[PDB]
């Protein structure tokens, strides 16, 4: 056998949302007695008071925080077998491989975490090539949940397409029986438009997750809850811990049939204009979290509502929702059928976390280690080998560690097509 | 965003791109330096014999002592057009302050370290002398980096042999505790802090290394356009222009002095900046050094490219096979000769019996006896005398240790001659000419040459400190390679000496010999020799 | 390994590491040999105060 030296090659990746992530790398030594953790404050909102006489009417300061941590390393640990009869070009082959698979994973959790928390939910009862520009239609109700919302968009906005309802768009374009700039080019190549309803980048992702449906029904909020912004809390030791205002727990009447990424809306509550607290008319999405216990579940934009009487003024300054849960109102669940999901966001939404393995140090001598720059996204690992002398072998493993992050769900969204009955 | 990441990463990129050549040289200097049984899995639970006969080791002290007995130095010349004496006065300071054993002990330093592993390298630094200044309170002074190869790691990015076109340069320090403190205390660091960097050693279990301390010098150069100010000197009238940067705190006192703005220019330039850096925090940020070039000059052997790889070899890397070879079949002949059993008879115990003393090795004796007789058998069975053969060296130890050093003798020649490797050093030598030419003009103070004398226009600021003024007219001269001289006046008696050799015994014979009489040296006869030549030159107009 | 110089008393250590690929761990050893011997035991001495009956 004389294995020709050419490669049948087979496959060709892109990884166009890790790209586009933010990647961020605090300092280690503080990371490390952190517990790979830190603490970001958010944006600050007053109130406001109307009158001359205001005694006993000063309010004070709030200021909110996020917090952004790490998960476990990716590896591709394999092994140099003594028995193996197989080449070295075959080990640097999978070397390659292992790259390739490592960018791959990273852009798969990018998209997951980002589908899955993302609280703006645009829903339509069918599908995208129904009626004429239904794409544009799509793009521009997302563009218009964002405007209406106030929510930031200075370092820029995009919209990931899957690719069947790419074509749909393109062939929405297509079937126009005119032909200037945009069909032509919509005809000679796929592309429908870079920026298209405001969006100033429109993408095709092939690795967009599919919602699956959620089998809940006749679900009620269990007795009126409030949810109040707050920096901090007591534990029982007496110390002040830090929460988190991207995450709340409601009790319901149960949570069978609900998953992570599931979306769901309560009859009633409308979302608000944020700074200027205008009451909108579309209800407020929200999307679940996780499911703990039977009877809470975890929702990621903190119902704040703006006519609960419990809110102290500074903490009333960060409502974002018209009303607040009251014991009966039924939760709607927004995702209906199966459908893959297009994803649109903020650039400054999603970031990556990273951090170092100093297997560099003096503490790993034997292993030979050096660092492992994946090209594409742009992560750094270490890749190790070392040898096993009683057994005439060696190890081979690239490791890589770092953090998919939503410092703001709230500007996240995914859009549902055809999620009709 | 992060400058201690950006730093970081741009270290690791480089040091896993010279990860092979750098494992392949620091072998080389164990190889050469420290033992050629590098076995770094020994596990010897039953000693053997391991001999040292070493046949490669008198060709690198060959080599060394014939590259040493031809020295090598930095020689300035004027360029095209410029004043046929523009660089007297930078060869002036490159003598001055490259004269010291500092500077030759880095050469050959480097110098060994090329020929063994395969690249050596050095630094040229500044720094405030004030008993015996070069010029301006200041000196510049060579130091020696030791296993450059190890310690000093470049932008990956870089195709040259003298890596003028890298961007970055990575130096580890690695120090003792006292060494550590007072580093710290030299630049200001925090003693108390130990700091710490990539340890560029990982020779494992025989290798006992000392409890140090490491950190890194992180050099780099930017290229930009920044502001200059053309104004007329007073004296000379002529546009002279200075870089905003240097003369920022200067530039009312140079309005007061009497200089009259002109313009203002743009000139590109590079600029260096140092930065201590640890694995963890980024100590000094970006402390702006002397010069237009990275102050470390490296030296290569066999240096080049194979795949986007760079790879440089000395002159030990091809011989270790077969060194290692030799070295096997001597021990074990060595095993043959201790552990044989020697020649000695084969003997039945019934055959002397009774007789055992006639053969312990005594020479009391006329003869040696046998008994004959069995009472059982009769009659002693007859068998012919048989002994133990003598140790040998096997045909296949003996061809082996043969063509192995046969092997190792062909392999080991450098050349036909170190003609190769001396280009490089003069290469080397030529980078670091242009390292101190652009340093001189950053910091010295440089005369200004006139057809109506010197001139030095330099000022002071109101915090009593005097701020250089160097003209743009000032790469006059262009660096080549001649031999090392101490001052200026040897050259100058080299240089007559050889128009002397040639010139023949016509006038200018005479001339010439008058002229090295002047340029003696003082004592007191060769002082009246000297007297009467400067006589006879005088009264001969 | 690395020599380890003990302060004090005059006495030199050996500390040592070594790396793990399996699990990205390392150990570590500090050790340090001697053996204390008593050459002349008649020259070494005791003193006991208040050793009474």
């Not at chain 1, 204009?273 to 008319?281: C, F, H, I, P, S």
Request: aromatic fraction near 10%; charged fraction near 25%.
């Amino acid at each position: 056998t004389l294995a020709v030296d050419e490669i049948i090659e087979t496959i060709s990746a892109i990884t166009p949302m890790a790209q586009k992530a933010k990647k961020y790398t605090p300092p280690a030594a503080s990371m490390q007695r952190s517990s790979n953790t830190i603490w970001m404050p958010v944006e600050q909102e007053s109130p406001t008071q109307e009158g001359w006489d205001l005694t006993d009417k000063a309010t004070g300061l709030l200021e909110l925080n996020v917090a952004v941590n790490m998960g476990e390393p990716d590896n591709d640990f394999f092994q140099l077998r003594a028995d193996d009869l197989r080449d070295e070009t075959a080990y640097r082959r999978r070397i390659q491989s292992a790259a390739r698979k490592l960018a791959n994973n990273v852009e798969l959790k990018v998209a997951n975490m980002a589908a899955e928390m993302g609280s703006l939910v645009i829903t339509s009862p069918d599908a995208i090539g129904t009626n004429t520009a239904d794409a544009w239609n799509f793009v521009a109700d997302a563009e218009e949940i964002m405007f209406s919302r106030e929510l930031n968009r200075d370092m820029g906005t995009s919209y990931f397409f899957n690719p069947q309802d790419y074509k749909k768009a393109g062939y929405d374009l297509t079937k126009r029986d005119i032909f200037g700039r945009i069909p032509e080019e919509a005809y000679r190549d796929g592309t429908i438009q870079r920026q298209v309803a405001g969006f100033d980048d429109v993408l095709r992702s092939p690795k967009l997750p599919v919602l699956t449906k959620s089998t809940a029904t006749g679900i009620t909020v269990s007795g009126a809850q409030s949810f109040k912004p707050v920096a901090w809390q007591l534990d029982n030791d007496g110390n002040k811990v830090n929460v988190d205002n991207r995450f709340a727990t409601v009790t319901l009447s149960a949570t069978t049939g609900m998953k992570r990424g599931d979306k769901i809306s309560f009859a009633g509550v409308k979302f608000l204009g944020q700074m200027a607290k205008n009451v909108l008319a579309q209800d407020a999405t929200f999307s679940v979290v996780r499911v703990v216990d039977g009877t809470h579940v975890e929702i990621t934009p903190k119902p704040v509502a703006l006519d609960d009487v419990s809110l102290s003024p500074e903490q009333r300054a960060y409502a974002n929702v018209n009303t607040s849960l009251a014991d009966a109102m039924a939760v709607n669940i927004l995702n209906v059928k199966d459908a893959r999901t297009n994803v649109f966001w903020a650039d400054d939404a999603i970031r990556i976390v990273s951090q170092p393995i100093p297997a560099n140090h003096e503490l790993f001598a034997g292993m030979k280690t050096t660092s492992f720059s994946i090209p594409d996204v742009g992560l750094n690992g270490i890749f190790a080998t070392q040898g096993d002398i009683s057994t005439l072998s060696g190890l081979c493993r690239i490791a890589l560690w770092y953090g998919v992050n939503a410092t703001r769900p709230e500007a996240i969204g995914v859009g549902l097509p055809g999620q009709t009955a | 965003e992060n400058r201690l990441e950006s730093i970081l990463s741009r270290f690791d990129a480089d040091w896993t791109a010279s990860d092979e050549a750098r494992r392949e040289a620091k072998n080389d200097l164990f190889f050469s330096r420290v033992s050629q049984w590098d076995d770094w899995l020994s596990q010897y639970t039953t000693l053997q014999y391991r001999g040292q006969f070493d046949v490669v080791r008198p060709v690198v002290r060959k080599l060394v002592s014939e590259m040493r007995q031809n020295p090598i130095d930095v020689l300035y010349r004027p360029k095209d057009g410029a004043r046929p004496d523009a660089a007297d006065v930078l060869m002036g300071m490159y003598r001055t302050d490259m004269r010291h054993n500092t500077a030759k002990i880095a050469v050959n330093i480097a110098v060994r370290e090329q020929i063994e592993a395969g690249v050596g390298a050095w630094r040229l630094v500044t720094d405030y002398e004030d008993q015996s200044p070069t010029s301006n309170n200041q000196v510049i002074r060579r130091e020696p980096i030791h296993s450059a190869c190890s310690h000093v790691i470049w932008d990956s990015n870089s195709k040259l042999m003298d890596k003028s076109d890298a961007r970055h340069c990575t130096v580890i320090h690695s120090m003792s505790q006292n060494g550590w403190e007072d580093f710290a205390e030299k630049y200001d660091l925090d003693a108390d802090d130990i700091p710490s960097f990539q340890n560029p050693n990982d020779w494992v279990f025989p290798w006992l290394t000392q409890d140090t301390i490491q950190i890194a010098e992180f050099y780099e150069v930017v290229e930009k356009k920044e502001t200059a100010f053309i104004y007329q000197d007073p004296v000379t009238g002529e546009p002279v222009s200075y870089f905003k940067r240097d003369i920022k705190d200067v530039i009312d006192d140079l309005a007061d002095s009497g200089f009259i703005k002109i313009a203002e220019r743009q000139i590109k330039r590079r600029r260096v900046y140092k930065s201590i850096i640890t694995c963890t925090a980024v100590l000094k940020d970006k402390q702006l050094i002397a010069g237009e070039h990275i102050p470390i000059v490296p030296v290569f052997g066999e240096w080049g490219f194979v795949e986007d790889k760079e790879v440089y070899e000395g002159v030990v890397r091809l011989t270790k096979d077969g060194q290692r070879l030799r070295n096997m079949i001597m021990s074990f002949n060595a095993d043959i000769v201790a552990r044989t059993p020697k020649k000695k008879p084969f003997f039945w115990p019934e055959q002397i019996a009774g007789f055992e003393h006639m053969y312990d090795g005594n020479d009391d004796y006329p003869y040696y006896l046998l008994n004959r007789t069995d009472e059982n058998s009769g009659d002693l069975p007859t068998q012919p005398l048989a002994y133990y053969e003598n140790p040998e060296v096997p045909q296949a130890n003996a061809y082996m240790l043969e063509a192995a050093t046969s092997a190792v003798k062909e392999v080991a020649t450098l050349g036909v001659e170190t003609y190769v490797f001396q280009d490089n050093l003069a290469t080397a030598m030529r980078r670091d000419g242009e390292i101190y030419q652009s340093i001189v003009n950053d910091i010295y103070d440089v005369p200004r040459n006139v057809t109506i004398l010197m001139a030095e226009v330099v000022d002071l600021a109101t915090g009593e400190k005097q701020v250089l003024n160097d003209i743009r007219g000032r790469y006059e001269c262009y660096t080549d390679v001649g031999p090392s001289f101490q001052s200026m006046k040897q050259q100058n008696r080299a240089e007559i000496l050889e128009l002397l050799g040639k010139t023949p015994q016509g006038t200018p014979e005479y001339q010439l010999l008058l002229l090295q009489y002047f340029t003696l040296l003082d004592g007191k006869g060769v002082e009246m020799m000297r007297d009467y030549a400067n006589k006879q030159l005088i009264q001969m107009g």
